[PDB]
Amino acid sequence: HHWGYGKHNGPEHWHKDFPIAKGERQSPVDIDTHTAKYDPSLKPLSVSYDQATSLRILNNGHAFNVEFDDSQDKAVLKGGPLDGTYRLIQFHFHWGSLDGQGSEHTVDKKKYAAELHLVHWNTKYGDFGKAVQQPDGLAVLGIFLKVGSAKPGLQKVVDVLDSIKTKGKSADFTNFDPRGLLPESLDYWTYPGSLTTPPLLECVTWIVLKEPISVSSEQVLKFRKLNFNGEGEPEELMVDNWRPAQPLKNRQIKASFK
Ligand SMILES: NS(=O)(=O)c1ccc(NC(=O)Nc2c(F)c(F)c(F)c(F)c2F)cc1
Ligand SMILES: [Zn+2]
Numbered sequence: 001h002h003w004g005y006g007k008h009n010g011p012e013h014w015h016k017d018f019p020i021a022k023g024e025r026q027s028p029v030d031i032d033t034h035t036a037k038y039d040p041s042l043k044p045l046s047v048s049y050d051q052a053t054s055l056r057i058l059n060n061g062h063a064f065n066v067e068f069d070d071s072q073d074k075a076v077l078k079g080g081p082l083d084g085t086y087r088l089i090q091f092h093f094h095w096g097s098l099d100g101q102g103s104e105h106t107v108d109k110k111k112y113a114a115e116l117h118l119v120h121w122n123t124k125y126g127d128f129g130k131a132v133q134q135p136d137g138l139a140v141l142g143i144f145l146k147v148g149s150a151k152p153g154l155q156k157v158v159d160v161l162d163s164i165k166t167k168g169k170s171a172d173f174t175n176f177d178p179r180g181l182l183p184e185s186l187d188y189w190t191y192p193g194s195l196t197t198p199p200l201l202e203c204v205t206w207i208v209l210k211e212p213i214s215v216s217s218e219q220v221l222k223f224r225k226l227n228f229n230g231e232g233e234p235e236e237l238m239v240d241n242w243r244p245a246q247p248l249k250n251r252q253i254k255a256s257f258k
Contacts (some may be wrong), residue, residue: 002113003018003197003198004061004062004228005062005095005212005228005240005241005242006236007021008079009015011169011243011244012232013061014198014200016033018037018198018199018200019199020194020200020201020202021056021151021200023090023194023200023202024038024202024249024250025192025193025194025202025249025251026193026194026200026202026249027104027105027193027194027195027196027204027246027249027250028103028104028105028106028187028193028196028206028208028242028243028245028246029105029193029245029246029251030105030106030107030108030109030198030245031105031106031107031208031248031253032108032109032253033107033108034108035211035253036189036252036253036254037252037253037254037255038255038256038257038258039253039254039255039256042051042081042254043079043080044079044189044205044254045077045079045186045188045207046076046077046079046080046139046181046228047077047082047084047182047186048075048076048077048078048080049075049088049177049178049179049185050075050179051075051175052068052074052075052088052176052177052178052179053067053068053069053074054066054067054173054174054176054213055067055068055069055073055104055171055172055173055174056092056170056171056172056173056179057157057160057164057170057171058164058167059069059164059165059166059167059168059169059170059203059226060167061091061167061168061228061232062197062228062232062241062242063070063092063094063238063241064092064093064161064164064226065090065091066090066091066092066094066157066173066176066178067090067173068088068089068090069091070087070088070089070121070128073085073087073123073175074087074088075087075088075178076088076120077118077120077139077141079206080188080190080207080256081123081205081207081254082139082207083136084122084123084124084204085123086118086121086122086123086138086139087120087121087122087123088118088120088178089119089120089121089128090119090120091116091117091118091119091178091181092116092117092240093113093115093116093117093222093223094114094115094117094196094241094243095113095114095223095239095240095241095242096111096113096114096126096239096240096242097218097221097248099113099225099236099242100113100221101113101241101242102114102115102145102242103144103145103242104142104160104196104210104242104243104244104245104257105142105144105206105245106118106245107144108175109155110142112145112146112212113144113146113147113220114144114215114220115142115143115146115242116142116143116144116145116146116181116203116213117140117141117142117196118140118141118143118181119138119140119144120138120139120140120141120180121138122134122136122137122138122139123125125151128131130173131203132195132201132203134199134203135192135201135202135203135205136203136205137170137194138203138204139204139205139206139207140204140205140206140207141207141208141211141212142206142207142213143181143182143183143209143219144208144209144213145212145213145214145215146212146213146214146215147214147216147217148214148215148216148222149220150214150215150216150218150219151180151181151214151215151216152180153177153179153180153181153222154181154215154219154254155219156176156181157176157253158219158222158223160173161222161223161225161226164226164230165225165226165227165231166227166230166233166235167227167228167229167230167231168230168231169231170180181213182209182213183209183211183212183213184211184249185191185209185210185211186209186256187209187210187255187257188207188208188209188210188255188256188257189207189208189253189254189255189256190205190206190207190208190253190254191206191252191253191254192204192205192206192251193197193205193251196242196243197243210257216253224237224238224239225237226238232249
C-alpha cells in the first residue's frame with residue numbers, strides 16, 4: 001500500500017508516511033499575481049541547454065522522466081534567484097484527465113492542463129542524492145501547458161510514449177533538445193518550496209514561468225494513454241498525477257517582472 005494519486009493513497013494520505021507533507025515550505029502553491037512582488041534585485045535568469053545530453057525516458061509509475069547525463073556541466077540553470085550552478089538531471093510532467101486540470105501550481109486559482117518540471121541540482125553538493133538533503137539543493141523550472149496549437153518540440157516525446165506504457169519500462173532517448181519546450185519569455189515567479197511528491201523534501205527553489213506553452217489536444221491525449229500500473233497488472237490510466245496547492249505559510253512569492 002504505497003503512495004500514489006488514488007482515493008486511498010493520494011495526496012490527502014501522504015502525511016502518514018511523510019509527515020513533512022504538512023511542513024512550512026511545501027509545494028505546489030497558488031500564485032496570487034496581485035500579491036507577488038517585483039524584486040528588482042533578481043539577476044537575469046540563464047538557461048544554458050545547448051550541450052544537453054538526453055539518455056533515456058522512464059515510466060516510473062508516477063510520471064515519465066526524460067533523463068540527462070549530469071556527470072558534467074552540460075545543461076545548466078543559473079542566475080535568477082540562484083547562487084551557483086544547477087545541473088539538469090531530468091524533466092517530467094504532471095497532467096489531468098480533462099483539459100481544465102493537471103497543473104500543480106495555479107495562477108490566481110487557475111489550473112492549466114499540465115505542468116512541465118525541469119529538475120536541476122546544485123553542483124556544490126556533488127550529487128543529486130546529497131542535494132535533496134539541502135534547503136538550496138534543487139532548482140525546478142516549472143512551465144505551464146495549455147491546450148491549443150501543437151508544440152513541435154514536444155512531439156518526439158509524445159511519439160515514444162507507446163514504448164513506455166507501463167511502470168518500469170524505459171527506452172533509449174538520445175539527442176533530445178529541451179530548448180524546444182520553452183516559451184518565448186523567461187519572466188518568472190520564484191519561492192522556496194519542496195518536491196511535490198514523496199518524499200516531499202524541502203530542498204527546492206521553484207522558478208515558475210509566467211508564459212505557458214501550447215500543446216495540442218492530440219499531444220495531451222497521448223499522455224493520458226500511459227499507465228500507472230506495470231505490465232500484466234490491471235490497467236489504470238496515468239492521469240491526474242498532480243498534487244493540489246498547499247498553504248503558503250510564511251513565504252513571499254517574488255516576480256522577476258512587473
Ligand atoms: N515534481 S518535482 O517536485 O519536480 C519532483 C522532482 C524529483 C523527485 N524525486 C526524484 O527525482 N528522485 C527521488 C528523490 F528526489 C528523493 F528525494 C527520493 F527519496 C527518491 F527516492 C527519489 F527517487 C520528486 C518530485
Ligand atoms: Zn514534478
